[PDB]
Design a protein around this ligand. Structure first.
Ligand code: HEM
Ligand SMILES: Nc1ncnc2ccccc12
Length: 289
């Protein structure tokens, strides 16, 4: 099953930079959301969930088909809360109705990471909306109650190795868990992209507690939290070495996250040899906007 990227007709870098800028302006404008976290973190999570349905074995799921717009995937229990990111992107899609759904959801993640001071993430256009019958069934996104072996095996389906898994999980510096969405609570209110997930794993005094939904999670007196799957990155000796590497090298973490995140957003897509090169969008700050 082959999904060939097809550039939206006549569009080029400038058109996508306009979409980027509308997303970024709205991120700056709509600042009250989720106790003043703003929409950055939920847009990063949306981009990952629309991508993380991919199965390398048969090329089902993945970001190409924009299938999150269909009720089966919109209503996936694993996606609870992402409706806020979808609603955020609705006026962007209205303004730019030519962009495909998969392009818009993945570009919403790139724009959020960059606007939150994260690394540049090269991004390629050309995902093409596919019909409702192509929507992947629920249950392809990962559980949070599990251990390192589960996380390792899970991510083999997405063709991610240990370093890619540890780098991608660094996005859990951002935003927070919400008891009503996932049965976990807490994390604070961070909306700046840094390597602090790894510093918090290594440096905080973690206690295994039960939350009000009767699920275990690791909490610190300082008010931080880690899901069991987060904490597993310091329980497994291979993951731990990489957590220490990223805790000690911001640039390395930025570069590795950028590559893994682009890869995640592009899994399943065949780019023609004459496709445009990946675009690197300028931030609003770089543009003086
Ligand atoms: C083992 C893999 C993962 C598990 C089990 C997991 C689990 C979760 C859970 C339970 C939440 C809270 C949802 C809520 O209550 O609103 C969450 C939030 C989030 N996740 Fe993950 N996640 C994983 C991997 C990732 C990856 C790979 C990324 C992106 C690279 C990511 C980005 C985020 C972001 C940015 C949030 C915050 C959303 C917000 O503040 O609304 N996650 N994740
Ligand atoms: N802020 C977070 N800290 C640690 N783990 C997480 C997991 C999901 C969302 C946010 C966080």
């Amino acid at each position: 099953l082959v999904h060939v990227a097809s550039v939206e007709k006549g569009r080029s870098y400038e058109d996508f930079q306009k979409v980027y800028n509308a997303i970024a302006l709205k991120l700056r404008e709509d600042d009250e959301y989720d106790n003043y976290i703003g929409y950055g973190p939920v847009l990063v999570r949306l981009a990952w969930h629309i991508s993380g349905t991919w199965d390398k074995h048969d090329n089902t799921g993945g970001s190409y088909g924009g299938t999150y717009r269909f009720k089966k995937e919109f209503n996936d229990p694993s996606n609870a809360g992402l409706q806020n990111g979808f609603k955020f992107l609705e006026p962007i899609h209205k303004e730019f109705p030519w962009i495909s759904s998969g392009d818009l959801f993945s570009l919403g993640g790139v724009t959020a990471v960059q606007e939150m001071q994260g690394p540049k993430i090269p991004w390629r256009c050309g995902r093409v909306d596919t019909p409702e019958d192509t929507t992947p069934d629920n249950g392809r996104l990962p559980d949070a109650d599990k251990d390192a072996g589960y996380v390792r095996t899970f991510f083999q389906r997405l063709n991610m190795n240990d370093r890619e898994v540890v780098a991608l999980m660094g996005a859990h510096a951002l935003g927070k868990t919400h008891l009503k969405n996932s049965g976990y609570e807490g994390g604070g209110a961070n909306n700046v992209f840094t390597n602090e997930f790894y510093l918090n794993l290594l440096n905080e005094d973690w206690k295994l507690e039960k939350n009000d939904a009767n699920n275990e999670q690791w909490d610190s007196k300082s008010g931080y939290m880690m899901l069991p799957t987060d904490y597993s990155l310091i329980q497994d000796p291979k993951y731990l070495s990489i957590v220490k590497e990223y805790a000690n090298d911001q640039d390395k973490f930025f570069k590795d996250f950028s590559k893994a995140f682009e890869k995640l957003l592009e899994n399943g897509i065949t780019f023609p040899k004459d496709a445009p090169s990946p675009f690197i969008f300028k931030t609003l700050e770089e543009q003086g906007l």
